[PDB]
Amino acid sequence: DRADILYNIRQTSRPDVIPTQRDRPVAVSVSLKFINILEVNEITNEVDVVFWQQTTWSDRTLAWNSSHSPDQVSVPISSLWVPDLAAYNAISKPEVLTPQLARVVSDGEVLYMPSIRQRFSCDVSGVDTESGATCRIKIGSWTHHSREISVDPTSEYFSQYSRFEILDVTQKKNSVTYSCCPEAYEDVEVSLNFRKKG
Amino acid sequence: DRADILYNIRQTSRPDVIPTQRDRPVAVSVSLKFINILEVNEITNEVDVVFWQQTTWSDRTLAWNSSHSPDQVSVPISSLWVPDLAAYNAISKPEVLTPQLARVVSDGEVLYMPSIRQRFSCDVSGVDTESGATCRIKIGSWTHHSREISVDPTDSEYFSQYSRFEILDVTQKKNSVTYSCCPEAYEDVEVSLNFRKK
Amino acid sequence: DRADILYNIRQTSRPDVIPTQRDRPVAVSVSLKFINILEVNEITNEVDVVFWQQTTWSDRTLAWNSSHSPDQVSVPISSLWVPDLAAYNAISKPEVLTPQLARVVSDGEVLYMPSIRQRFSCDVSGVDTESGATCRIKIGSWTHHSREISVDPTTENSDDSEYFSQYSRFEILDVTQKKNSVTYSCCPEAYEDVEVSLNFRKK
Amino acid sequence: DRADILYNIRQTSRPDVIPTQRDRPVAVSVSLKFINILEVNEITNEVDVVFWQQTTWSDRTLAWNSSHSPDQVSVPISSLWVPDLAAYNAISKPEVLTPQLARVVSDGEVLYMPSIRQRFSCDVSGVDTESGATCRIKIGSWTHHSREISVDPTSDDSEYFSQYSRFEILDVTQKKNSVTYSCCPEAYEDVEVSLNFRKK
Amino acid sequence: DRADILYNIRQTSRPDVIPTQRDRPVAVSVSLKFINILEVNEITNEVDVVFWQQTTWSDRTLAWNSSHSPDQVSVPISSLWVPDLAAYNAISKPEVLTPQLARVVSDGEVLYMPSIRQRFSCDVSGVDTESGATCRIKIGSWTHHSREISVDPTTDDSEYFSQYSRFEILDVTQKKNSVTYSCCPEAYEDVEVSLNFRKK
Numbered sequence: 001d002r003a004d005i006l007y008n009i010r011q012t013s014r015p016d017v018i019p020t021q022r023d024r025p026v027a028v029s030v031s032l033k034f035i036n037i038l039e040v041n042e043i044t045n046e047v048d049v050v051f052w053q054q055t056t057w058s059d060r061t062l063a064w065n066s067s068h069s070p071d072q073v074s075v076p077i078s079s080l081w082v083p084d085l086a087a088y089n090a091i092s093k094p095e096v097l098t099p100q101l102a103r104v105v106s107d108g109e110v111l112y113m114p115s116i117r118q119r120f121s122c123d124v125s126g127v128d129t130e131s132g133a134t135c136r137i138k139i140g141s142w143t144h145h146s147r148e149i150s151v152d153p154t155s156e157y158f159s160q161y162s163r164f165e166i167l168d169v170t171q172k173k174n175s176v177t178y179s180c181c182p183e184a185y186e187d188v189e190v191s192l193n194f195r196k197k198g
Numbered sequence: 199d200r201a202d203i204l205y206n207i208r209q210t211s212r213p214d215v216i217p218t219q220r221d222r223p224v225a226v227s228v229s230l231k232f233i234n235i236l237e238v239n240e241i242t243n244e245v246d247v248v249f250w251q252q253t254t255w256s257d258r259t260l261a262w263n264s265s266h267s268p269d270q271v272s273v274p275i276s277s278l279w280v281p282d283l284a285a286y287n288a289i290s291k292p293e294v295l296t297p298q299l300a301r302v303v304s305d306g307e308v309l310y311m312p313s314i315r316q317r318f319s320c321d322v323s324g325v326d327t328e329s330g331a332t333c334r335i336k337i338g339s340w341t342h343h344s345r346e347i348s349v350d351p352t353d354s355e356y357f358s359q360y361s362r363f364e365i366l367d368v369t370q371k372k373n374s375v376t377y378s379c380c381p382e383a384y385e386d387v388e389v390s391l392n393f394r395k396k
Numbered sequence: 397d398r399a400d401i402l403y404n405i406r407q408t409s410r411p412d413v414i415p416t417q418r419d420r421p422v423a424v425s426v427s428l429k430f431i432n433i434l435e436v437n438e439i440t441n442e443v444d445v446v447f448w449q450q451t452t453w454s455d456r457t458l459a460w461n462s463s464h465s466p467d468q469v470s471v472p473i474s475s476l477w478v479p480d481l482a483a484y485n486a487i488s489k490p491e492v493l494t495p496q497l498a499r500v501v502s503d504g505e506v507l508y509m510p511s512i513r514q515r516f517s518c519d520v521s522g523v524d525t526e527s528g529a530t531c532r533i534k535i536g537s538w539t540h541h542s543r544e545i546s547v548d549p550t551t552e553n554s555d556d557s558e559y560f561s562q563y564s565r566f567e568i569l570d571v572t573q574k575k576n577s578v579t580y581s582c583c584p585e586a587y588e589d590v591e592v593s594l595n596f597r598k599k
Numbered sequence: 600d601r602a603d604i605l606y607n608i609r610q611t612s613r614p615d616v617i618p619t620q621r622d623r624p625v626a627v628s629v630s631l632k633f634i635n636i637l638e639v640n641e642i643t644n645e646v647d648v649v650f651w652q653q654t655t656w657s658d659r660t661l662a663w664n665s666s667h668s669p670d671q672v673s674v675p676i677s678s679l680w681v682p683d684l685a686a687y688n689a690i691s692k693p694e695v696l697t698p699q700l701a702r703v704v705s706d707g708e709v710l711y712m713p714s715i716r717q718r719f720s721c722d723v724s725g726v727d728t729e730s731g732a733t734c735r736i737k738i739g740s741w742t743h744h745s746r747e748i749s750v751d752p753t754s755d756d757s758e759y760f761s762q763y764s765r766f767e768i769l770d771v772t773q774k775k776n777s778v779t780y781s782c783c784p785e786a787y788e789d790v791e792v793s794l795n796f797r798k799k
Numbered sequence: 800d801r802a803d804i805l806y807n808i809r810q811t812s813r814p815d816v817i818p819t820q821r822d823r824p825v826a827v828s829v830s831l832k833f834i835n836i837l838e839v840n841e842i843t844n845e846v847d848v849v850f851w852q853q854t855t856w857s858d859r860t861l862a863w864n865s866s867h868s869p870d871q872v873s874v875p876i877s878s879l880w881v882p883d884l885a886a887y888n889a890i891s892k893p894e895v896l897t898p899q900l901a902r903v904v905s906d907g908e909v910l911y912m913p914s915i916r917q918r919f920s921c922d923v924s925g926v927d928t929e930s931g932a933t934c935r936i937k938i939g940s941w942t943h944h945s946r947e948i949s950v951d952p953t954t955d956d957s958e959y960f961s962q963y964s965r966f967e968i969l970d971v972t973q974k975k976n977s978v979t980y981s982c983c984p985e986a987y988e989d990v991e992v993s994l995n996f997r998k999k
């Protein structure tokens with residue numbers, strides 16, 4: 001039953017150890033589902049956004065045989081390793097709006113999708129036109145380079161009561177290298193093309 | 199006595215384990231008792247509301263024979279499993295204003311009713327009219343589908359006489375939604391708050 | 397000594413267990429001592445207030461013989477049961493400004509008086525007049541009914557001129573704190589509260 | 600070594616028990632070093648202030664022989680008893696800006712100096728003149744009376760005061776006081792800090 | 800492997816004890832990488848900044864033989880000693896925007912770089928001109944003097960700055976300071992960071 005699965009998880013899950021298999025990197029899939037655009041300032045180039053951050057990855061230290069057992073459980077994220085994702089152009093702390101629970105499938109596949117309110121620095125010019133503005137958000141591991149964590153991409157849920165509407169969303173994979181460091185860090189660049197409603 | 203009951207509750211309650219019995223779902227009742235409407239913005243469609251979030255459910259692992267005992271106790275919710283409920287259109291963290299204590303009956307019936315201040319995105323249009331505005335708030339489990347958690351409904355009586363607004367009607371209807379991504383159904387209660395400026 | 401008294405207190409105190417004796421309720425005395433009034437909004441009927449919440453009750457499981465010991469000690473409230481008081485018309489979380497320490501007397505009497513800043517919904521009308529405004533705040537247990545917790549004022553009436561800031565834009569004309577026992581539709585039980593009427597006006 | 604000292608302190612320190620020696624009081628020294636005056640409101644009589652709260656006292660239960668060991672260490676305040684000091688006229692929670700670490704000397708002398716931003720209710724009248732306003736802040740133990748805690752002052756303190764503030768400090772006086780209340784038979788000691796300051 | 804390295808760190812790390820090698824000081828390198836200027840107030844002399852706080856130091860108790868193992872790991876900072884650095888003219892709590900993880904190399908070298916949003920008191924005069932304003936930020940250990948913590952610059956500091964800010968960076972200079980105070984017999988080291996920036 002579920003208590004057993006959680007107990008075993010508590011026994012074997014190592015929340016501070018990245019679950020790399022055969023010394024290849026962990027493949028993290030990240031996809032943003034925009035829910036609201038709350039505040040926009042064309043002068044400062046700052047936006048206040050609400051989004052579901054769909055995150056999936058594999059951790060075999062959580063897996064169990066589900067032949068006559070449940071095949072999925074909800075588990076506190078503190079009992080699990082979670083990717084240390086950060087939005088590189090963020091200017092507020094992510095405000096998590098939802099219960100911090102992840103879904104674990106018996107094969108060790110993990111899905112964690114918090115609802116997040118966060119403020120970003122990005123290009124707001126054109127928000128009042130019909131081409132719209134395009135705000136770019138880059139999300140990637142803060143401390144794990146491309147050999148430890150890879151980041152891959154995978155408007156339906158957007159609020160009808162926003163002052164804004166979404167024209168398009170593109171999610172592309174990027175990789176940034178730095179002076180200080182020899183390795184490249186992956187991110188997904190999320191282009192939010194949106195404009196103020198007419 | 200009460201130390202005994204709390205002590206056994208500490209022995210038996212598994213706060214991270216959903217108390218499903220025989221693989222039926224936990225049946226959760228949710229009812230919002232509105233106390234105040236504090237800030238209203240028709241331009242941005244945002245409201246600041248205070249409500250008592252009446253939440254009831256059963257956890258039989260908490261039960262005790264109450265023949266020569268109290269049949270009810272107050273218990274910190276951190277000692278209990280609580281449903282992972284979220285308001286889908288919330289745009290602030292719920293700010294809990296009250297002591298986070300639930301009431302537990304000897305048969306394992308749990309009552310948790312925090313007073314909550316929260317900000318929502320919803321249709322504020324018509325608030326200064328005689329029809330009023332109708333703000334809809336949907337509350338449901340964030341990670342548990344209908345085979346694990348069911349949500350059912352069970353309001354001017356508690357509403358502040360000092361609000362600038364008055365309540366015209368409250369309707370609570372249950373929904374059950376299936377998704378693109380996912381094979382299972384998720385239940386919610388939709389609370390339609392019809393209110394206007396005095 | 398003090399280290400011993402706190403040791404015994406930790407041996408026997410249970411913060412999640414109301415210290416009811418002989419199936420009777422715990423008698424809680426509550427008194428709000430207002431120190432400042434920060435914001436008042438007559439349009440929205442809201443106030444921002446700072447007050448000392450004098451809270452006393454008895455817990456006989458903490459008692460000790462003080463013939464050759466101190467007769468009073470300070471204890472983290474995380475080591476004690478404290479009443480789950482809430483103001484029914486609060487519109488913000490209580491913000492505690494002071495060290496969260498309770499005073500425990502050798503006979504088991506507990507005094508906890510946090511300094512608190514909080515916002516309330518209440519009648520602000522007349523505050524710019526000379527009759528003043530009268531804002532009523534009700535404080536009672538959130539989850540314990542009258543057979544488990546009773547709530548009383550310590551003293552009912554004062555002008556509070558011993559505690560209220562002289563540098564406020566407001567002055568206090570009167571504070572009367574009276575006991576109530578108010579009921580709800582849903583429930584067969586009565587809940588006790590103290591209703592605190594703050595009569596104050598803008599200077 | 601330093602780990603040994605931290606261990607010994609954890610063994611002898613009772614962070615929840617006041618370190619009175621044979622029922623005489625703990626002598627706490629308190630001194631405010633003003634760093635900035637951030638917001639000032641003459642209509643509401645409120646000021647937003649940043650200050651270093653120098654707090655020193657003795658806990659002989661922490662002492663050790665430092666003949667060939669360090670004579671001082673830094674320790675999380677959670678490992679120590681600290682005085683339950685509070686400002687009687689504060690209207691906000693003190694916002695601690697610095698790491699919450701105390702310095703402990705091998706003779707058991709403790710220094711804790713948080714940098715604090717806090718908002719107060721006090722006399723702001725005259726702030727736009729050349730005599731300036733004089734704001735009084737009272738800091739004392741919240742729950743310990745004078746036989747348990749005594750409070751004494753330890754300057755212009757403009758030595759640390761910010762030059763980029765809109766305000767300047769004309770004088771700071773720190774006087775010791777001890778005030779009694781109606782209900783109760785005992786007095787509580789405090790340091791009253793007088794900030795004479797004006798708009799530049 | 801990595802579980803073994805973390806287990807080993809957890810076994811050997813002493814998070815509340817400063818890891819001096821003999822009686823030499825712990826050498827912390829500090830470098831601020833400015834990312835944004837969010838708010839600027841020329842009347843009050845206050846700025847709101849976002850920056851990456853590059854912090855490096857060595858702790859050999861964390862060292863391991865990485866012969867056929869990984870040479871680096873990510874570790875929660877709660878498992879490590881980290882220097883009690885504080886900004887001397889800050890007027891808000893540092894708000895950490897990023898996961899609070901440090902990078903540890905097999906030789907005991909630690910890299911911790913949080914993204915931080917913080918408000919400072921500093922000279923904002925000239926921001927609407929072409930000389931620009933020069934805001935100066937001082938960062939150093941709050942409680943460890945120079946015989947326990949040394950603080951030095953690394954060496955850019957403005958390459959990763961947002962192109963979408965209302966402001967631009969004209970120059971960043973980082974110099975080392977060393978101050979002794981009236982009260983205390985020791986000197987405390989800091990890094991001074993000069994941010995020359997203007998409104999576009």
Ligand SMILES: Clc1ccc(CC2(COc3cccnc3)CCNCC2)cc1Cl
Nearest residue numbers: 141142143178180185853902910911912
């Ligand atoms: Cl000095 C410097 C050091 C590292 C980086 C790389 C990044 C931060 O990597 C770390 C590594 C360990 C601890 N904390 C941050 C890579 C992730 N996205 C922000 C940049 C950039 C700079 Cl500029």
Ligand SMILES: Clc1ccc(CC2(COc3cccnc3)CCNCC2)cc1Cl
Nearest residue numbers: 054103111112113339340341377379384
């Ligand atoms: Cl993309 C996507 C869109 C919608 C949903 C379904 C909902 C979220 O279910 C989960 C499941 C596991 C972890 N967190 C959230 C169903 C509950 N109310 C919010 C939506 C799931 C996904 Cl994965």
Ligand SMILES: Clc1ccc(CC2(COc3cccnc3)CCNCC2)cc1Cl
Nearest residue numbers: 252300301309310311538539580582587
């Ligand atoms: Cl619907 C409803 C309406 C009012 C009340 C009574 C109060 C809440 O009692 C509880 C009991 C258990 C858990 N949390 C609150 C106490 C009287 N003050 C808040 C109202 C209870 C319910 Cl259930």
Ligand SMILES: Clc1ccc(CC2(COc3cccnc3)CCNCC2)cc1Cl
Nearest residue numbers: 450498499507509740741742780782787
């Ligand atoms: Cl009613 C009343 C009025 C004044 C005081 C004295 C003060 C509060 O002392 C305590 C003692 C134990 C626990 N908490 C507070 C002395 C400290 N600064 C606020 C006042 C105590 C009471 Cl009980």
Ligand SMILES: Clc1ccc(CC2(COc3cccnc3)CCNCC2)cc1Cl
Nearest residue numbers: 653702710711712940941942980982987
């Ligand atoms: Cl009054 C006074 C004024 C300045 C200093 C030195 C500094 C603070 O040092 C300590 C030492 C032990 C505990 N906490 C702070 C040196 C660090 N940057 C702030 C100043 C110490 C004192 Cl005591």
